[PDB]
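Run: sequence + H33 -> complex structure.
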Amino acid sequence: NTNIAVYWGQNSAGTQESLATYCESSDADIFLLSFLNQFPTLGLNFANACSDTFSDGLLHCTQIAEDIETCQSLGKKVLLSLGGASGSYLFSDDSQAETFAQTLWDTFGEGTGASERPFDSAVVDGFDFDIENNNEVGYSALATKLRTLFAEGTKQYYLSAAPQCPYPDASVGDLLENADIDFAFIQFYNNYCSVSGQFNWDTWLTYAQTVSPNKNIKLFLGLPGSASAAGSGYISDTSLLESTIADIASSSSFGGIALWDASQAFSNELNGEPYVEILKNLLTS
Ligand SMILES: Cn1c(=O)c2[nH]c(Cl)nc2n(C)c1=O
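>> structure
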């Protein structure tokens, strides 16, 4: 199809509402929980949306857990996003990351090993790799091991990556080249290759067609939800938005639009219509 993905958790706009609030919009389909910012030693950060912890200090988030389940009843997909700009994360090798697949499965997925579960009995629909530290070690091996474990589950799981538009990406390039990935939420902002810059969708399309181990990987046009969601690359021209979408929706590789982040895209108005709503509507046509 064509979906809207939104990051949620880091409260970019200040006025961030509950996960479920955004799920109860018609406006977004995929929700990326931002972030598991610390690993292999587990650490979550959802700005103001979760502050309770287990005794060991790992976040414990009952409201998000309830909201994951509400979101899923409404047909939405909820992935846990790893990493972030800033944060505290690194794999020393493939074996370490393979161990970590099991940790994720037992902590967030349908794994049976009795670890502390930040989301109680709520189960994510998969993981986003928003690696922004320019270290690529382990992610490919982690994704591949996760896939083997997913077969033990009772639903489809998704893996995504959040590269910036320069190709190849210095953090998730290896992941994208050597693992089976469902969605690429490519950040077309803070970079020369934005829509208004030297837009390089064509390179990503070559990647999807010839390089991606998953040939029906879906590429997403990743955008700021407001001017001031990022330093640069935000698009307020609905004609440019229209022509862009028309250019890129031609192929089976086009998945939709990704936005940083829900707080921003839902509160940013273009004459009283939320930005996320404008974009959802541009996609449907
Ligand atoms: C802090 N930060 C992120 O962690 C992030 N991930 C993605 Cl995909 N976009 C962004 N932006 C724009 C950020 O500012």
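>> summary
The chain is about 30% helix and 20% strand. Residues 1-285 form a domain with the TIM Barrel fold (CATH 3.20.20.80).
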